[PDB]
C-alpha cells in the first residue's frame, strides 16, 4: 500500500509526542471538525496569514484524536500528511505521477473514511507536476472533491490562496474557506506557557514567566513583520540559545586564559623572575573560576535531569490517562511529583545562591538583548557607561555645538525619553521643528546626533527637502503605485526605515518645498504609520524626525534682546502659523528657536575648525601652531550678525590655506617645523623655525 | 527556525563570515554545541542542470534532504544566493525548491545558512512571504 | 444596497476624530489596527488610485491586487 | 576578482582592443604571467540554443565551467 | 564637507566669464568639452528642475535620470 510509501502518519508521531501542545482554538478546531463532518465537500482549507499556527492547528486536531477529545465520528481516524514531492519524485517516465495519484486515491477509497488526508501548501497542488501530456493534478481530484470521496485538509497562506488557487474559481469553490484569526496578547501568553515547558525540555534552562509576558509585549510592539505568536516564540528560543551559549563558555575565563597563556609564553621566552609566581597565581585564580563553573554546571545538570524525570513522569501519567490503569494514576502522581518538585526548587534556590559569573534564567534583560541585537532599537537596560554617556549628553554636544542651549536641552530630553521607556508607543520618539537664522546649527546638531547616537556623521537618513517644490515629489519618498514605473524598487524612505528602524531622519530646509508636501508627515507625526505603494507598512515609533527652517530670521535678528524666550517662541509660532498649515505644527513636540551667535562662540568654532585643520595637515605630515592674536584677527575677520558662522569658515579658508598651500606648493615646507601661524601686519604668516 | 540569513549591502563579506565561522569550528574556538559539525555549500546549479525530465529535480533535492536526515544534525548546510533558491526549479506548473523546503525548515530538521543581498531580498523574498 | 453607516467628520484636529475611530475598532474588534486606516496623503495625486484598487491586468501589479 | 569590463559609447572598437591584447600575447609583449594563455570568446546567446527545458542552459554553463 | 570652490561671478557683458571657465577646462582637461555646462536660462519657470535631478518615480523620466 503506497499510503505507507508517500505519506506522513501524523497520528503516530502525535502518539509518539513529537508534536506540540495546541492551546485555544476550540472554536476553530470545532469548525474544522464541522467541515470535515459533512456529506459533500468535506474539505476545509486553512486560510491563515503566515505563521499563526496553521500546521499547529492540524497538529492539534491530530493530538485530540490520539487523545479522543473529539466527537465520536472522528474517534479512531487516521490523518496522513501528503508530500507532494513524493508524488512527483519518481515520475521520469510519462504518466507515473498519475499512477501514483490514482493508486493513493483508490487506497483512500479502500480505507473507507478512516484516513483524513492532509495537504499543506495547497497552492502548490494547483498545477502540480504537469506538462503538455499531463492531467495537471487539479483535474484528477476535483470530482472526488465535489462528492466528498476524500477528506482533504488544506493549509495555505492568504497571498498564495488569492494568487494561485483562485486562478480557477471552481477549484476554489470545491474547498471551504476557514479563516484563522490573529492570536492576541493573551493567546500568545498561553501558547508560550505550553511551549515554554517544551523549550525548557529542550534547552536545559530556566525561564521567568514575567519575562515571557515581557517578550510578548515587546514582540507585538517592535517587529512589524511576521505575525503572532511566531515572533514571540522566536524571542523565547533565541534568548534560550543565548543563555545556553553563555553557559557553554565564560568570557572572563577566556580573557584570563589569554592572560595565562601570555604569561606562559613570556616565561618560556625568559628561559629575578616573579613571573613564575604571577603565572601560578593567575592559574590558581583561573582554576578556582573553572572549578566553580564546573560545579555549578553539575548543579544545573542535576537540576535538568530531575526536571527531565518530572517530564517523564508527566509522560507516564498521560500514558495512564490514555490506557486506564487506576491505582497507577495516584501512585505515579503522589510518588514522583512533589518530592522531585521540592528538590528541584531546592537546587533552584541553591543556584540562586551560587550563580556568580553565570546565568541560569531567562529574564527580561535577555529578551531585551536579543531584541536589541535583532533589530537595533535600543531597548536593553543600560550599562552605566552608556548611562553616564547619556549623562555626558550635553557636554558632548558642546564638543560639536557651541551655544544653542534651548535645543541642546530639548534633544537631550527626547533621547532621555527614548531610553527611559516613558516614550509613547504611538508617536515617533520626538517631533522637532528647528528655527534660526542661517548657519547656527540647524544641520550641525543633527550631524552631532548622528555622531553621538550612532557614532558616525553621515549615517542619518538625510532626505534633503530642497527639491520638493512640486506635488510630484511625494513619490520619491513613498514609492510608486503598481504598474507604474517605480513599483519594483519602492521609495527612498521606506527602505531607509524598514532597514534600520532607529535612525534620525532630517528633513532639511522644510519651507522651501511645495507647501503641502507635508501631509505625509501628518501620517508620520500622528501615528507613525506610512504605507507606501507596494502594500507594506512602516512603523515610525522608533525614530526621531527633525525639521529645519529659517522663517523668523528677520524677527530673530530683530528681537533677540528685550524679550523672554516665551514671547520669542509665541511670536515665531505666529510666524509659522502664517506659513504652515494648522494641521501640521500641532503634531510637533517642540519648536525651538536657535539663538544668534556671540563672539566666544565664533572663537570656539574657529578653534574646532583649526583642530580638524591640524588633523588634515597631520596626514599631510605637518604640524602648525597659531598666534592667539591671529585667532583674535580671525575673530575680527569672521564676525557678522547677518550670516552666522559660514563667513568665518570661508575667511579662515582663504586667509590661511591660500598663503599656506601657496608656500607648500612653493615647494618649501620641510615637515617637522611646527609652523607658528604668527601674524603678518594684517595677514598671518606661516613660518619655518 | 534553525536558519539565519545574512543581509547587507553586498561586498561586505557575508560569504567570508560563513567561512570564518567554519574556521572557528575547525579551530575548535566555537562554543561546544556545534563542535565537530560539517559545513557544506549547496549549489543551485548542480541540482538543476540535468533535470530536463519531469520531477527529477525534486528527486535530487529529496535525496539530498534524506541524506541530511541520515546525518542527523551534524552538517550545517550552506546556501549562497538564497534569492536564487526562491525561483530555482520554479518550473511550469511544477514544484520549485522553495515549496519543498518550506516544511523542511520549519520543523527544525535542517540548519541552512543564508547569504543574500538586501536588494535581492526585497526582489525575491519579501514578495514571497512564507519563505520569509 | 448600501454600507452600514457612512460618516464624514469635521472640526480642527486633535479633538479625537481618528482616536474615536480607533476606539470603535478597539470596541468592535479588539485592536486599533485591525481596521483599515488609510490616511489620504498617500493619495494626493491622480495616478495613485492603483494604490488602493490596483493595477489593471497585464502588468507587474497583478500579483498583489489592491 | 580577475575580470575587468570595458566601457564607453560604441564605435570605439573595444572588440579590437581585446584583439590587440591577444595579438600582443601572440607577440609576447605581456608580462611573464600571461605567456601561453588562451583568449577565447563566447556569446551568452550561443547557449540559448534550446531554451525550453529545465537546466539545459545551466548544464551548458556548468559544463563550460568544468 | 563642502565642494571645492563656489563662485558667483559678477561682471558686465563679454568680459570673458565663460571663456575663463573654458580656459580652466582647457588647462585641466585639455578641452572645453569636459565640463558640465548647464545652460541656466531655460529655467524661467520653476518646474524644469527635473531636467537636472531626474523625474520622481511614477512619472516619465525615471529610467534616465536628470
Amino acid at each position: 500500500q503506497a499510503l505507507k510509501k508517500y505519506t506522513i502518519d501524523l497520528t503516530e508521531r502525535a502518539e509518539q509526542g513529537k508534536l506540540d501542545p495546541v492551546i485555544g482554538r476550540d472554536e476553530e478546531i470545532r469548525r474544522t471538525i464541522q467541515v470535515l463532518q459533512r456529506r459533500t465537500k468535506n474539505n476545509p482549507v486553512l486560510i491563515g496569514e503566515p505563521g499563526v499556527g496553521k500546521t499547529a492547528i492540524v497538529e492539534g486536531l491530530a493530538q485530540r484524536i490520539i487523545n479522543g477529545e473529539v466527537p465520536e465520528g472522528l474517534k479512531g481516524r487516521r490523518v496522513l500528511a501528503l508530500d507532494m514531492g513524493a508524488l512527483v519524485a519518481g515520475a521520469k517516465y510519462r504518466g507515473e505521477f498519475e499512477e501514483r495519484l490514482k493508486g493513493v486515491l483508490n487506497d483512500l477509497a479502500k480505507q473507507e473514511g478512516n484516513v483524513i488526508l492532509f495537504i499543506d501548501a495547497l497552492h502548490t497542488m494547483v498545477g502540480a507536476g504537469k506538462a503538455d501530456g499531463a492531467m495537471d493534478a487539479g483535474n484528477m481530484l476535483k470530482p472526488a472533491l465535489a462528492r466528498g470521496e476524500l477528506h482533504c485538509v488544506g493549509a495555505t497562506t492568504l497571498d498564495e490562496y488569492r494568487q494561485y488557487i483562485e486562478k480557477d474559481a471552481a477549484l476554489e469553490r470545491r474547498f471551504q474557506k476557514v479563516f484563522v484569526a490573529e492570536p492576541s496578547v493573551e493567546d500568545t501568553i498561553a501558547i508560550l506557557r505550553g511551549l515554554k515547558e517544551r523549550y525548557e525540555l529542550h534547552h536545559h534552562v530556566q525561564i521567568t514567566d514575567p519575562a515571557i509576558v515581557a517578550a510578548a509585549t515587546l514582540s507585538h510592539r517592535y517587529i512589524a513583520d511576521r505575525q503572532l505568536p511566531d515572533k514571540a516564540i522566536d524571542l523565547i528560543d533565541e534568548a534560550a540559545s543565548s543563555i545556553r551559549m553563555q553557559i557553554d563558555s565564560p568570557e572572563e575565563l577566556d580573557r584570563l586564559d589569554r592572560r595565562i597563556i601570555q604569561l606562559k609564553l613570556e616565561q618560556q621566552a625568559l628561559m629575578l623572575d616573579m613571573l613564575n609566581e604571577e603565572l601560578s597565581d593567575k592559574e590558581r585564580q583561573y582554576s578556582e573560576l573553572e572549578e566553580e563553573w564546573k560545579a555549578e554546571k553539575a548543579s544545573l545538570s542535576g537540576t535538568q535531569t530531575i526536571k527531565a524525570e518530572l517530564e517523564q513522569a508527566k509522560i507516564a501519567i498521560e500514558q495512564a490517562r490514555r490506557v486506564g490503569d487506576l491505582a497507577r494514576m495516584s501512585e505515579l502522581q503522589y510518588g514522583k511529583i512533589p518530592e522531585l518538585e521540592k528538590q528541584l526548587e531546592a537546587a533552584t534556590q541553591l543556584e540562586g545562591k551560587t550563580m556568580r559569573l553565570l546565568r541560569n534564567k531567562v529574564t527580561d534583560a535577555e529578551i531585551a538583548e536579543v531584541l536589541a541585537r535583532w533589530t537595533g532599537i535600543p531597548v536593553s537596560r543600560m550599562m552605566e557607561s552608556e548611562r553616564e554617556k547619556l549623562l555626558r549628553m550635553e557636554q558632548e554636544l558642546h564638543h560639536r555645538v557651541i551655544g544653542q542651549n534651548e535645543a541642546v536641552d530639548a534633544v537631550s530630553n527626547a533621547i532621555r525619553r527614548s531610553r527611559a521607556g516613558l516614550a509613547d508607543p504611538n508617536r515617533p520618539i520626538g517631533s522637532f521643528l528647528f528655527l534660526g537664522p542661517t548657519g547656527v546649527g540647524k544641520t550641525e546638531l543633527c550631524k552631532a546626533l548622528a555622531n553621538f547616537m550612532f557614532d558616525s556623521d553621515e549615517a542619518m537618513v538625510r532626505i534633503d527637502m530642497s527639491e520638493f517644490m512640486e506635488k510630484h515629489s511625494v513619490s520619491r519618498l513613498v514609492g510608486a503605485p503598481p504598474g507604474y514605473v517605480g513599483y519594483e524598487e519602492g521609495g527612498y524612505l521606506t527602505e531607509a526605515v524598514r532597514r534600520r528602524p532607529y535612525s534620525v531622519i532630517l528633513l532639511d530646509a522644510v519651507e522651501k518645498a511645495h507647501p503641502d508636501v507635508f501631509n505625509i508627515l501628518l501620517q508620520v507625526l500622528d501615528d507613525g504609520r506610512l504605507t507606501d505603494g507596494q502594500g507594506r507598512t512602516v512603523d515610525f515609533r522608533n525614530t526621531v524626525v527633525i525639521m529645519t527652517s529659517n522663517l523668523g530670521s528677520d524677527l530673530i535678528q530683530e528681537r533677540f534682546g528685550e524679550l523672554d524666550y516665551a514671547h520669542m517662541k509665541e511670536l515665531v509660532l505666529g510666524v509659522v502659523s502664517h506659513n504652515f498649515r494648522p494641521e501640521f505644527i500641532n503634531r510637533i513636540d517642540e519648536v525651538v528657536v536657535f539663538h544668534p551667535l556671540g563672539e566666544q562662540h565664533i572663537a570656539s568654532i574657529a578653534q574646532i575648525q583649526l583642530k580638524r585643520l591640524y588633523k588634515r595637515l597631520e596626514e599631510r605630515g605637518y604640524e602648525i601652531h597659531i598666534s592667539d592674536e591671529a585667532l583674535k584677527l580671525l575673530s575680527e575677520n569672521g564676525y557678522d550678525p547677518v550670516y552666522g558662522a559660514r563667513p568665518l569658515k570661508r575667511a579662515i579658508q582663504q586667509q590661511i590655506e591660500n598663503p599656506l598651500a601657496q608656500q607648500i606648493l612653493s615647494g618649501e615646507l620641510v615637515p617637522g617645523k611646527v609652523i607658528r601661524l604668527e601674524v603678518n601686519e594684517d595677514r598671518i604668516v606661516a613660518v619655518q623655525h | 527556525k534553525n536558519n539565519p540569513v545574512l543581509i547587507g549591502e553586498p561586498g561586505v563579506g557575508k560569504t567570508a563570515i560563513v567561512e570564518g565561522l567554519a574556521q572557528r569550528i575547525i579551530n575548535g574556538e566555537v562554543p561546544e554545541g556545534l563542535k565537530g559539525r560539517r559545513v557544506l555549500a549547496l549549489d543551485m546549479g548542480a541540482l538543476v542542470a540535468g533535470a530536463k525530465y519531469r520531477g527529477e529535480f525534486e528527486e535530487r533535492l529529496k535525496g539530498v534532504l534524506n541524506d541530511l536526515a541520515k546525518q542527523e544534525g551534524n552538517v550545517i548546510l550552506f546556501i549562497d544566493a538564497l534569492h536564487t533558491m526562491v525561483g530555482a526549479g520554479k518550473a511550469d506548473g511544477a514544484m520549485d525548491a522553495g515549496n519543498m523546503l518550506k516544511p523542511a525548515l520549519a520543523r527544525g530538521e535542517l540548519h541552512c545558512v543564508g547569504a543574500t543581498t538586501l536588494d535581492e531580498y526585497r526582489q525575491y523574498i519579501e514578495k514571497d512571504a512564507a519563505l520569509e | 444596497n448600501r454600507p452600514i453607516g457612512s460618516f464624514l467628520f469635521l472640526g480642527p484636529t486633535g479633538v479625537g476624530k481618528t482616536e474615536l475611530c480607533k476606539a470603535l475598532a478597539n470596541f468592535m474588534f479588539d485592536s486599533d489596527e485591525a481596521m483599515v486606516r488609510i490616511d489620504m496623503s498617500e493619495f494626493m495625486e491622480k495616478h495613485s488610485v492603483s494604490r488602493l484598487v490596483g493595477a489593471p491586468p497585464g502588468y507587474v501589479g497583478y500579483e498583489e491586487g489592491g | 576578482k580577475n575580470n575587468p569590463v570595458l566601457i564607453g559609447e560604441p564605435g570605439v572598437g573595444k572588440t579590437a582592443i581585446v584583439e590587440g591584447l591577444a595579438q600582443r600575447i601572440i607577440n609576447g609583449e605581456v608580462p611573464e604571467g600571461l605567456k601561453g594563455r588562451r583568449v577565447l570568446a563566447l556569446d551568452m546567446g550561443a547557449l540559448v540554443a534550446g531554451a525550453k527545458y529545465r537546466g539545459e542552459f545551466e548544464e551548458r554553463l556548468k559544463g563550460v565551467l568544468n | 564637507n563642502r565642494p571645492i570652490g563656489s563662485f558667483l561671478f559678477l561682471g558686465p557683458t563679454g568680459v570673458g566669464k565663460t571663456e575663463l571657465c573654458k580656459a580652466l577646462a582647457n588647462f585641466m582637461f585639455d578641452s572645453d568639452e569636459a565640463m558640465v555646462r548647464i545652460d541656466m536660462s531655460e529655467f524661467m519657470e520653476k518646474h524644469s528642475v527635473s531636467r537636472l535631478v531626474g523625474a520622481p518615480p511614477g512619472y516619465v523620466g525615471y529610467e534616465e535620470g536628470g
Binding site: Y93, A134, Y484 | - | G58 | - | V60
Partner: peptide, 24 residues
C-alpha cells in the same frame, strides 16, 4: 521497447510599464 518522458518547457511572461505624465 522504449518509453517516453515528460519535459519542462518553461519560460516567463512579458511585462509592461505605465507612465503618468503630469499636467501642470
Amino acid at each position: 521497447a522504449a518509453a517516453a518522458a515528460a519535459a519542462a518547457a518553461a519560460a516567463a511572461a512579458a511585462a509592461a510599464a505605465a507612465a503618468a505624465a503630469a499636467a501642470a
